[PDB]
Structure formats: C-alpha cells, structure tokens
Design a protein around this ligand. Structure first.
Ligand SMILES: NCCCNc1nc(-c2ccccc2O)nc2ccccc12
Length: 265
C-alpha cells in the first residue's frame, strides 16, 4: 500500500485483476495483480502460481519476474516486473494482422527460449498463447506471463487442465490425458500458425481432433512443415524443442534489438 503507487487497470479475467504501478522507493515500473482466494483452484508451499513464478524468476529470462507478493485476508497480491512500453502479442497481431515470417521467426524463437527455461526450472506453463506473451517494444524482447494454470513439470500423465481449450491438444480433447512437453509443443504449433496467419487454426473440438491444417495466408513451405510437425495428432510424432529450434525455418534468427529496429520502430 505504501510501497507501491497504483495506476490504471491493465487487464482482468480468470487470472484476476492486473494494475499498472510504480514502486515508490525507486520509481521502478511494476504490475500489481490481485486474485481472490476463493477464485484460486491450486495451492502449494500460497497459490501454485507463486510457487511456479519463484522457480522461474531467478536469473534473467523471457519470463516476467515475480518481485514480491503479499497475502491479504481474502486475496493474494503479486508484484511483477513491467517493461515500458509493452503490448501483448494478441493486441499486436490484432493491430497488425499476420506477421512477416522474419518477425514470426524472431518472436517464436524467443518463446521457445522462454519455455525451455521454464522446463529447465521444473515448470510447465500450460497456457502458452498470444495473450500470455508480452512484447517489450523498445528492446524487441518477449516475456511470458500467467502461470496461473501451470504445474510442476513431471514425466507422468496429466489428467487435469484449465488452460485455453483451442490451444489444447487432441489427446486432452479425446482422453483427458496429455504429457507436458508434447502438449506444450502442440500449443506452440497453434501459436506459430497464429503468428503467420493472424488467427488460430482450429475453433471447434472436432477440428482439433481431425488435425487438418488449412493455411488462409501465404506461408512458406518450411514454415507450414514446422507447423504441421508441431500439430501431429500422435503426441510421440511431435518434435522435441531441440528439433524445433534446429528446423530449417528457424535458422538465422534476428537478435531482439534488430527485431525492434526493423519491425517495431
Ligand atoms: N493479456 C492480458 C495482459 C494484461 N497485462 C499484464 N498481465 C500480466 C499478468 C496477467 C495474468 C497473470 C500474470 C500476469 O503477470 N502481467 C503483466 C506484467 C506487465 C505488464 C502487463 C501485464
């Protein structure tokens, strides 16, 4: 209360309410996110989201870092990093339409680096999508947000999910079972299609199940191939992170600052 000055509401939804703010001591820009305890589904040791953020908030990353948190009688309050100026990937794509492949290559690469960092830290995000990706527009750097539906990463089967359905894999739709990495890779396929086409490939359960990809925009063969690989119906047929980043479409990525200079300035 006295440590932060609160500004505008930035967003609200299933994750709670997120406000802009300034840390009073040093003027550091922050985001202040409130969520009601009753609206919290999962807990650890605090909300699971706090556990997962601390595991990935150490060191530098393509993840929005947790700086502090507070418990109130009926809510938890998270103090998060806030780049300025910033825009989420959903609003960016909405404003600009399908992204040029060079731009999509750079963004997608940074998303992959961030997700690998989560996985190395023992964290599975479970809601990778355009709305959960922030763009620092000056540095051309991408940051993941919203670990509110994530879990500790494990090698056994998940039978629960509360992420975004249209990014969820066919095995979740049919069987209510998935494994972490291969489900992550599927959502990455949806994300990459979204970047180069300006919209998601599937809307209904049976389209996800059928897994046929139609391209509504001109997209290179190499990119279509990577997308179709990530969206293989058999989880085991999907690429590993390593195979994604060694894919020919992923070669010669721009540096983030180059990306900002060319595409964001
Ligand atoms: N797509 C909704 C995004 C609303 N804005 C923002 N949302 C969040 C945010 C939203 C949900 C969960 C955790 C989070 O950190 N964190 C932000 C951090 C800095 C700047 C903006 C932010």
């Amino acid at each position: 209360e006295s440590q932060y000055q609160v500004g505008p509401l930035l967003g609200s939804g299933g994750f709670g309410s997120v406000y802009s703010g300034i840390r009073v001591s040093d003027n550091l820009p922050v985001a202040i996110k409130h969520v009601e305890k009753d609206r919290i589904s999962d807990w650890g040791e605090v909300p699971m989201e706090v556990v997962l953020l601390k595991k990935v908030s150490s060191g530098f990353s393509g993840v929005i870092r947790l700086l502090d948190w507070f418990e109130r009688p009926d809510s938890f309050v998270l103090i998060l990093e806030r780049p300025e100026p910033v825009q989420d990937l959903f609003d960016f794509i909405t404003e600009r339409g399908a992204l040029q492949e060079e731009l999509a290559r750079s963004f997608f690469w940074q998303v992959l680096e961030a997700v690998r960092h989560c996985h190395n830290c023992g964290v599975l995000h479970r809601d990778i999508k355009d709305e959960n990706i922030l763009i620092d527009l000056n540095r051309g750097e991408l940051k993941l947000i919203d670990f509110g539906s994530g879990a500790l990463l494990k090698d056994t089967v998940y039978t629960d999910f509360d992420g975004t359905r249209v990014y969820s894999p066919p095995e979740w739709i049919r069987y209510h079972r998935y494994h972490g990495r291969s489900a992550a890779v599927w959502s990455l396929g949806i994300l990459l299609y979204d970047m180069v086409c300006g919209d998601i490939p599937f809307e209904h359960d049976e389209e996800i199940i059928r897994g046929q990809v139609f391209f509504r925009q001109r997209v290179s063969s190499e990119c279509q191939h990577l997308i179709r690989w990530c969206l293989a119906l058999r989880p085991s047929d999907r690429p590993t992170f390593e195979e994604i980043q060694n894919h020919p479409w992923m070669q010669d990525v721009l540096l983030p600052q180059e990306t900002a200079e060319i595409h964001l300035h």
